[PDB]
Amino acid sequence: FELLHAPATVCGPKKSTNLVKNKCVNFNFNGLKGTGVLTESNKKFLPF
Amino acid sequence: EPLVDLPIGINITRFQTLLALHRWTAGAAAYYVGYLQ
């Protein structure tokens, strides 16, 4: 395998921990990094 | 809306449309081609 960075078709397993809500947490969602409290959302996201 | 994103990773400079010849014989079709800038 080639480790030179390029579009990576094959990737090792990512590791998702359990999700907590209503508590201040550092959070990561597919590379999106933030600090905050997560709560249920009324806003209607589009599927994509 | 986005349909797919494909990691093809190849260069493209031309494209060709594909028409299905039904039961050669095919009905009239109308299609439109514009170029993004």
From Swiss-Prot, chain B:
Glycans are attached at N11. Binds to host ACE2. RBD also interacts with the N-linked glycan on 'Asn-90' of ACE2. Cleavage of S generates a polybasic C-terminal sequence on S1 that binds to host Neuropilin-1 (NRP1) and Neuropilin-2 (NRP2) receptors. Interacts with host integrin alpha-5/beta-1 (ITGA5:ITGB1) and with ACE2 in complex with integrin alpha-5/beta-1 (ITGA5:ITGB1). May interact via cytoplasmic c-terminus with M protein. May interact (via N-terminus) with host bilirubin and biliverdin, thereby preventing antibody binding to the SARS-CoV-2 spike NTD via an allosteric mechanism. Attaches the virion to the cell membrane by interacting with host receptor, initiating the infection. The major receptor is host ACE2. When S2/S2' has been cleaved, binding to the receptor triggers direct fusion at the cell membrane. When S2/S2' has not been cleaved, binding to the receptor results in internalization of the virus by endocytosis using host TFRC and GRM2 and leading to fusion of the virion membrane with the host endosomal membrane. Alternatively, may use NRP1/NRP2 and integrin as entry receptors. This is Spike protein S1. The chain holds residues 224 to 271 of 1273 of the full protein.
